Amino acid sequence: AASCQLLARDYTGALAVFTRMQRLAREHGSALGAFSDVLVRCEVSRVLLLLLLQPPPAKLLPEHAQTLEKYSLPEELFLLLQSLVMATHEKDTEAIKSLQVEMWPLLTAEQNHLLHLVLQETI
């Protein structure tokens, strides 16, 4: 259901369906297995949306507040995602260009679509 709304260009309705996947695995998974791979896909793709559309503190939930303090899941890909939330808060045009070159094999091409639309809306 998250692969539909990014074809349908519903990037704000796409934040509603990613916080519902993560609220069940802390009730059912804590992670196991089958539920351990559902939580890798949902904390790499809720970070590429809050820089795409950067919500105001009224409509920023207490679940969205927790994940952005940790940055400002594999050890290869956990290190390049703390570095990308910093640059768009510093508006660093040279920092964002060398990371898509070095995060293209890491993601899959559903997560490769959300990183393309951030680098344009900051440049």
Binding site: E76, L79, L80, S83, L84, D92, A95
Partner: protein, 285 residues
């Protein structure tokens, strides 16, 4: 006149010699079975656990001193399995059985036999074979834990840091190589040699997982060598495009300046030179 020290130590080092002329030099489907080869290489696995209990637990005092005058010694005109003959069998055990060439690494350290001919083949001192990196990274976690115990010998400190640089850092989540580094932070002259090595190996320390393990090892070093960690934090590693690797080398370079001025102003100026301080600030403007 054979000592009782001498009778029981020729029986356990020449029974390592019977099990290793077979597994190398016997055919695998001709003379033995495969169910009979699950249990033939598994009797060499619990007889090398019996020899590292006698040399470590200290209750067996007389048996430890007997092997050291034997591995240093030649065979009796060729009447025994001498120590250079026994070690040719084990490097062709590298590849078929890599879990049992990590148990033969910890015996040769324990006898005072740190001979740099055998220790270079197992660590490759200047695609890949998949069954050697268990032994190459396995004999360098075991060669540090021998250095950490008796760190008074400085000949073994200056070898492993100058040569193995990209391997010494990339293991730093391990309990025998986590203890090798803290003693280097304790030692005055041993800390200064670790920092000359990274400046030669900055070309490989650029991938995002290899640079997170340097800052946990360049975190706290000696205060007499905090003037060489501040020219490395500015010239080489700060220009990385990773914005949480440019943010975490701001925590470590501001902290060197603060402990130095509450310290003596005499020893710190000879540490960070007045001619060398003017080179750093032209790079930033």
């Amino acid at each position: 006149k054979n000592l009782p020290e001498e009778t029981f130590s020729r029986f356990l080092l020449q029974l390592v010699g019977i099990l290793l002329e077979d597994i190398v030099t016997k055919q695998l489907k001709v003379e033995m079975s495969e169910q009979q080869h699950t249990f033939y290489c598994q009797e060499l696995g619990t007889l090398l656990m019996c020899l590292i209990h006698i040399f470590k637990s200290g209750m067996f005092r007389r048996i430890t001193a007997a092997a050291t005058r034997l591995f240093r010694s030649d065979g009796c005109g060729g009447s025994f399995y001498t120590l250079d003959s026994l070690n040719l069998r084990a490097r062709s055990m590298i590849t078929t059985h890599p879990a049992l060439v990590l148990l033969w690494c910890q015996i040769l350290l324990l006898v005072n036999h740190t001979d740099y001919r055998w220790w270079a083949e197992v660590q490759q001192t200047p695609l890949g074979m998949c069954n050697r990196e268990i032994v190459r990274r396995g004999a360098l976690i075991l060669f540090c834990d021998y250095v950490c115990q008796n760190l008074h010998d400085s000949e073994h400190l200056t070898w492993l840091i100058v040569n193995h640089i990209q391997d010494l850092i990339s293991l730093s989540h391990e309990p025998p190589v986590q203890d090798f580094i803290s003693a280097v932070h304790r030692n005055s002259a041993a800390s200064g040699l670790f920092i000359q090595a990274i400046q030669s190996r900055c070309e490989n320390l650029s991938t995002p997982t290899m640079l997170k393990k340097t800052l946990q090892c360049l975190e706290g070093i000696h205060l007499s060598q905090s003037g060489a960690v501040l020219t490395l934090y500015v010239d080489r590693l700060l220009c990385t495009p990773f914005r949480v690797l440019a943010r975490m080398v701001d925590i470590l370079a501001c902290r060197r300046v603060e402990m130095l001025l509450a310290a003596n102003l005499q020893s710190s100026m000879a540490q960070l030179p007045m001619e060398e301080l003017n080179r750093i600030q032209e790079y930033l403007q």
